[PDB]
Amino acid sequence: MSDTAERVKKIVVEHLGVDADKVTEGASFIDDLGADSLDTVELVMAFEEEFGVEIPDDAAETILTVGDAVKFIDKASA
Known part of the structure; x- marks a missing residue:
């Protein structure tokens, strides 16, 4: 039902190569995925x-x- 969510999640699944279900609102790419600030930065730039x-x-x-x-991304998208 979401326009931005589906997009972001999709890109994250195609980029990280992980499961989509795990990609939830309360999913921290730092802990949930066990990544560092680096990963976060890269993702941000990509989006x-x-x-x-x-x-x-x-x-x-x-x-x-x-x-x-x-x-x-949705906020800046406008």
Whole structure:
């Protein structure tokens, strides 16, 4: 039913190569996936280039769980 969620999650599943079910709003790419700030940054950049938006650097710091990254891309998408 979601437009941005499905997109973000999809890209994450095709990029990370993990399960989609695991990609939930409360899914932290840091712990849930056991990744570091690096992974988060990379993902953010990918989505930014995919949708074609412009966000600050601090944004990557605010993006912890899927819901964060998704909500961000959707917010900047407008």
